[PDB]
Amino acid sequence: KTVVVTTILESPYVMMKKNHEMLEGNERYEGYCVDLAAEIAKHCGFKYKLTIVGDGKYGARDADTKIWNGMVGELVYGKADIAIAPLTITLVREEVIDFSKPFMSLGISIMIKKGTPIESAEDLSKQTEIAYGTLDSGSTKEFFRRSKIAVFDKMWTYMRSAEPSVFVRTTAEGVARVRKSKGKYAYLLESTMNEYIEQRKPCDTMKVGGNLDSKGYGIATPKGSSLGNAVNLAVLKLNEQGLLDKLKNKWWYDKGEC
Amino acid sequence: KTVVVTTILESPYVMMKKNHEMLEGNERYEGYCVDLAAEIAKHCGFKYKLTIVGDGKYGARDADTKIWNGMVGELVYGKADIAIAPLTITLVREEVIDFSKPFMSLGISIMIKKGTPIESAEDLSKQTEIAYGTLDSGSTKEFFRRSKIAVFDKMWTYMRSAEPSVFVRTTAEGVARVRKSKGKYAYLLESTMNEYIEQRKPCDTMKVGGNLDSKGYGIATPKGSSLGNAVNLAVLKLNEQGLLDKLKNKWWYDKGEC
Ligand SMILES: N[C@@H](Cn1cc(Br)c(=O)[nH]c1=O)C(=O)O
Numbered sequence A, B: 001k002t003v004v005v006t007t008i009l010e011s012p013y014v015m016m017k018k019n020h021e022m023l024e025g026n027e028r029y030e031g032y033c034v035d036l037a038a039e040i041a042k043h044c045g046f047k048y049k050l051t052i053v054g055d056g057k058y059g060a061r062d063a064d065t066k067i068w069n070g071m072v073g074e075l076v077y078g079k080a081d082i083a084i085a086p087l088t089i090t091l092v093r094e095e096v097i098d099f100s101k102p103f104m105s106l107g108i109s110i111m112i113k114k115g116t117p118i119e120s121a122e123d124l125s126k127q128t129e130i131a132y133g134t135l136d137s138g139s140t141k142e143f144f145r146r147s148k149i150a151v152f153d154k155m156w157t158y159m160r161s162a163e164p165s166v167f168v169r170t171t172a173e174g175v176a177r178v179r180k181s182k183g184k185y186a187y188l189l190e191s192t193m194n195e196y197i198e199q200r201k202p203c204d205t206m207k208v209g210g211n212l213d214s215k216g217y218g219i220a221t222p223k224g225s226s227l228g229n230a231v232n233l234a235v236l237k238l239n240e241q242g243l244l245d246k247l248k249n250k251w252w253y254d255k256g257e258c
């Protein structure tokens, strides 16, 4: 049985090739996770079909209905067999799906235009002339919602009631907002993404300060999946072979344009 | 029943308290992993007994005898129920025991006596005046033994054949060797340990270059253990609540001597 892989369009993890018009199936896509999927499938010995998550979300549980959305939801309800994407390993998700050991390490970071008078999270929390937000239905927004750290909690009380909404549906929207806000908007996002964007023209953004936390991305499978064990050992093998480092250089700096 | 925890004397994870002869049981020890063990036990709801691994090793399988030694061996043969220490999550180990998601991220790094003209692994491999080695019998040594990467294999070729041995029995032994070498010995060790030593008197060592790889430490349990699931969720909860960052600051920098 062909394995249904759920993923999300997030550069440089999964992007449609420039010549996708003449391509079909998994060939239409390219990116870090596309290469990863091929490796995993090869080592675990299975055939697969890459599918972009229906609602374009990573995964969160509806407080009122208790229904899971995003890629997590597709695994939970059996719409997909495995998720290969920049999906953060978290406690709430681990309670409903399985995660392989991390294939990438990262942390929340700050993205600023360039010339923006901000160097840390504390700086952002000390002023109000510059707005800031995060992505939606993701671990970043949840981080601030659950954080007890003085600075992070203060930032949340602002973002929560901010008008207009400082949250964005997609990373692209957030980066675009930073670039066109004359430096009046800072974006909080996962470090790996921040670093990628800093190497993309117009080369007008930059990562400032250290990461606010430590976390990792993992390959997810529904609980009780016959793929779980094999996939986990596959990720470890690939990391130990140095393939994962090989893949990040390829998509992050070998293609950098700054 | 009381849970038997195997761990290892490796500063600052587990250390003998100054007046340990005056104390009993778990109170004889102090450190990052001692603090972590208490927290894992509280959150998982079990009583425990800290024990220091008999052979003072982390864990490897002897080719020929097929017997596992170190903390891994204590779990494999049922001498301990859980291992809470700076134990690296590796494929070969994952095949015989279970690991929680990582509680600490790190990579192999280079430690030099201040002033040593070395800035990378490539630098080390391209010269011979400066000797270098690793902790014997651990995942760092195995990384070089198993690596297929040119630079790292070249380093392995030299280290395995060096006489006298460039390998050391304990981290302290390696650090002392760097300190007494007048710059003629560099030490390859896990990054977080390198960082710890850099903050200890006489403040004569430092970490140089980037990490050679990326991996993490995990809490280990025997396969099929009834504790596995709970321990994993506890680690994720503790990381998300910021405790792990708190513990590193406490044992690394709050007590920094440089
Ligand atoms: N990895 C997250 C999604 N995600 C992604 C990016 Br990029 C970001 O900046 N913030 C997030 O929460 C998850 O798994 O929810």
Ligand SMILES: N[C@@H](Cn1cc(Br)c(=O)[nH]c1=O)C(=O)O
Residues within 6 Å of the ligand: B058, B059, B086, B087, B088, B089, B135, B137, B138, B139, B140, B141, B171, B188, B189, B190, B193
């Ligand atoms: N973490 C390793 C042990 N270990 C420890 C230190 Br500190 C080091 O520098 N190298 C190692 O291999 C393992 O699990 O074998």
Ligand SMILES: [Zn+2]
Residues within 6 Å of the ligand: A039, A042, A043
């Ligand atoms: Zn391969």
Ligand SMILES: [Zn+2]
Residues within 6 Å of the ligand: A062, A063, A064, A065
């Ligand atoms: Zn709702």
Ligand SMILES: [Zn+2]
Residues within 6 Å of the ligand: B039, B042, B043
């Ligand atoms: Zn606690």
